[PDB]
Amino acid sequence: VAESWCYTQIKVVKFSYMWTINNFSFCREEMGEVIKSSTFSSGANDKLKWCLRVNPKGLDEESKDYLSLYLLLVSCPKSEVRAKFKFSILNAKGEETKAMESQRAYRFVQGKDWGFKKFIRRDFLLDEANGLLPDDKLTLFCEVSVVQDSVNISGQNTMNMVKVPECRLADELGGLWENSRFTDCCLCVAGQEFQAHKAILAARSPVFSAMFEHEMEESKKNRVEINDVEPEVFKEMMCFIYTGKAPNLDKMADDLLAAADKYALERLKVMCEDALCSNLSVENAAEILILADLHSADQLKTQAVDFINYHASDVLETSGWKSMVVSHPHLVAEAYRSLASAQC
Amino acid sequence: ESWCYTQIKVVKFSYMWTINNFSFCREEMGEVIKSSTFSSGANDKLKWCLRVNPKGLDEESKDYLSLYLLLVSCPKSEVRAKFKFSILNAKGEETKAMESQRAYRFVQGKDWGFKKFIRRDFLLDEANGLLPDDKLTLFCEVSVVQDSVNISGQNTMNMVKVPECRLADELGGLWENSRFTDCCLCVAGQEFQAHKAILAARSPVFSAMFEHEMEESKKNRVEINDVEPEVFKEMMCFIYTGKAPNLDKMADDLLAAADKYALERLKVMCEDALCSNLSVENAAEILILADLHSADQLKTQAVDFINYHASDVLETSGWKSMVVSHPHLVAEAYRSLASAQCPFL
């Protein structure tokens, strides 16, 4: 309807970073002495690289009590990148208070530097009443808004007289479980019967498939001894194997995660990690560390280490952490190495 | 999320210096009191010192006492330093002492400092309380700072990220290894292997006769002749890999196979591929194929194309061939035209 479908959508890659200028009150690398930062990227593939250039005393003498900051593009593929940036003045609580943003999105090319002359006054930063230098530490928050804005669409306005269902590989196999049809062999776990067959299980499971052919199916095809999981978790992985999804996640993520680690099912591991990553807590941190370590969830190890870094004030005395300490010296050694060396 | 950090290392150390009986020292010297060396902070890396001039080295310093600081030893020529000095607050005096405003480069063996301090008699004046037991206490703070930084930081994190979904890898991976050879189907000479449950699920027609309680005999001597082996391989690739890159040039045979196997999905993709294949010279053949295969969507598209391009479609002899061979098609086309064109004589 309406012939054309002009739906021009603007793609804005928004991402922000924060500074840490140690003891700015007496750095005094002024009047042309260049200072750089850590190069940073948006994360969406490696094309864009920025480096800051701060002048405590700005170039030219007109910015005597004023400072000017310039963002420089070190190198990028030639695409005439257009982007927008903003900065702010920060408080002790780490929230932007006096936020100033660039009026327009500035066109960038390789090696070009864009910034505002006399960006901000020196004395207001140095004002004691404003409290912008807690422990003489200066923080500066920047929010980049790189925009591509390169999209052209033509056509088509197909009325779609016939509705085409998508691929039916999952639901057709998903609906066969309750019917329990075409099950050649038996399958019992923890004394409860779950009628399934080894063909599709072998097809959708390399571990069992390797285990299937090697000197069991000749004799013990009908009965296979499974005890690592209770039926409530085995049915969940069964549903995941056939349907391709495990909707009952949050209530039973942990034991599902352990079962996935036993069978080396990476997708189950990461999605259970997603379920449990949001559930990080002071009281539950220790058992999360132990479960991640036993399951070799390195990413969950890192996130839990970060949680301990941010909550060392209270997590350390928790009885779970003490149990981890007495039981798992290696975990606490790793935590000490991370929080000591990387942080300092 | 960067964690810029940007450490700027500074080592603030100090060196108290106290001269016993300062009144008597003014006479038995004219130039310098070379003090002892000192170090602290970073593992005693740097040796520093100082020397006062109770009597001025030069005429300018004859008016004002000079405490002109010196460097003893250092590894690097470039050493930026801020040095502040005062009295050791015996009474209440945290003022009256100056500062070094600008960071100066301290090279090996060189001396640097200030010299305009105080009048000599005023310093010796007891009213100012600068002679505790005839001693001169100093609170000499030195702050060395370094070529900037040690940048980074990074703070690269966005949740945890997940691997690619693994529906197709399991099917494709098993086929490549050629493991679990459940059956050997010999069709057109070439031998093809496959499994039971997946073929039954994807193809209901294959599931039809294998549901009749006979499977072992048929698999050993399966009869497949309506479809060429190449289209069978294309079917295998579409089922397992999930793509049919060369479907465009084999739509007719693949569409016929889908009709035989009652594959609505494959038939739909075949019709869609054939939709963007109509030309001005072979429209009759496409319409005949659509009618034979009961392609309702393709048949309707062909009818619309003919209605639009009848000025040239009827010119070709294919229309006359259809008229002679298929009178019922002409009859129903005329019925549709008359019903659609109610007005006009």
SS3 call for B255: helix
Contact (Cβ atoms closer than 8 angstroms) between residue B57 and residue B33: no
| Closest partner CB to B149 (pick from A16, A35, A164) | A35
Start-end of H helices in chain A: 122-126, 169-174, 176-179, 198-203, 206-213, 231-243, 253-263, 266-277, 285-295, 298-310, 312-315, 319-327, 329-337
What's the CA gap between B83 and B94, in Å, rounded? 16
* Separation of alpha carbons B81 and B83, rounded Å: 6
Take residue A153 and report the two structure tokens written for it: 């669409």
The experimental method, as deposited, was cryo-EM
d(CA A238, CA A222): 17
Q: Which two tokens stand for residue A76?
A: 């990028």
**Which chain B residues in 198-217 lie under 8 Å from chain A, judged by CB atoms?**
198, 200-202
CATH number 3.30.2130.30 is the correct assignment for the domain at A15-146 = no
Q: Contacts of residue A263 in chain B, CB cutoff 8 Å? A: none
Q: Which structure tokens are listed for A160?
A: 């779609």
The neighbour count for residue A173, using CB atoms within 10 Å, is: 19
Parallel, antiparallel or unpaired: strands B136-145 and B10-19: antiparallel
Using only C-alpha atoms, what is the Rg of chain A?
29
Q: Which amino acid is at B202?
A: R
> Do residue B163 and residue A29 have CB atoms under 8 angstroms apart?
no
The residue among A37, A208, A272, A280 with the most chain B CBs within 10 A of its CB, best to mutate, is: A37
SS3 B203: coil
Instruction: Indicate yes or no: CB of B300 within 8 angstroms of CB of A17.
Output: no
Query: What are the start-end ranges of the E strands in B54-199?
Result: 66-73, 80-86, 104-105, 111-114, 136-145, 185-187, 190-192
Q: Which two tokens stand for residue A14?
A: 């928004």
Q: A242-280 in b/e burial notation, b at 16+ Cβ within 10 A? A: bebebeebeebbbbbbbbbbebebebbbbbbbbbbbeeb
- Is B2 in contact with A270 (Cβ distance < 8 A)? no
Please give, rounded to a whole number of angstroms, the shortest distance from the CA of B140 to a CA of chain A.
18
CATH of domain A168-274: 3.30.710.10
Tell me if A241 sits within 8 A of A264, measured CB to CB.
no
The residues with which A263 forms a beta bridge, in sequence order, are: none
**What residues 103-122 of chain B have any CB closer than 8 A to a CB of chain A?**
103
A278 to chain B: closest CA residue: B159
Contact B154 A19 (CB under 8 A): no
Q: What is the resolution of this structure in A?
A: 3.6
Interchain CB contact of B334 with A (< 8 Å): no
CA distance B12 to B146: 12
Please answer yes or no on whether B160 and A271 come within 8 Å at the CB atom.
Answer: no
Q: Which residues are paired to A142 by β-bridges? A: A17
Cα(B259)–Cα(B245) distance, integer angstroms: 20
Give yes or no for a contact between A138 and A126, defined as CB atoms under 8 angstroms apart. Answer: no
Cross-strand pairs, B82:
B143
Please check whether residue B328 touches A, CB under 8 A. no
CB B201 to CB A299 under 8 A? no
Are A7 and A153 within 8 A, CB to CB?
yes
**Cβ contact B283:B302 at 8 Å:** yes
Taking the C-alpha atoms of residue B288 and residue B246, their distance in angstroms, rounded to an integer, is 23
Q: A72 with A113: CB under 8 angstroms? A: yes
Contact between chains at B163 and A266 (C-beta distance less than 8 A): yes
Residues of B in contact with A69 (CB under 8 A): none
- Say if the Cβ atoms of B8 and A17 lie within 8 Å: no
Q: How far apart are CA B6 and CA B151, in angstroms?
A: 5
Distance in angstroms (rounded) separating the CA atoms of residues B149 and A19: 13
- Tell me which residue in B148, B159, B165 faces A29 most closely, judged by beta carbons: B148
CATH, range B13-144: 2.60.210.10
| Nearest CB neighbour to B196, from listed A168, A199, A277 | A199
- Is-contact A269 A291, C-beta < 8 A? no
**Cα–Cα distance for residue pair A273/A134, rounded to 1 Å:** 37
Which among A21, A13, A18 is positioned nearest to A95, based on CA atoms? Answer: A18
d(CA A204, CA B169): 9
CB distance from A253 to chain B under 8 Å?
no
Residues in CB range of B220: below 8 A, 6 or more apart: B183, B184
Most A CBs within 10 A among B5, B144, B176, B213, hence the mutation to make, goes to B5
State whether CATH 3.90.1200.10 applies to domain B166-272. no
Give chain B's radius of gyration (CA, Å). Answer: 50
A176 contact residues in B (CB cutoff 8 A): 201
Interface check A1 vs B, CB under 8 A: no
Q: Do the Cβ atoms of B165 and A202 come within 8 Å?
A: no
Residue B277 token pair: 């294949």
B299 touches A at CB < 8 Å: no
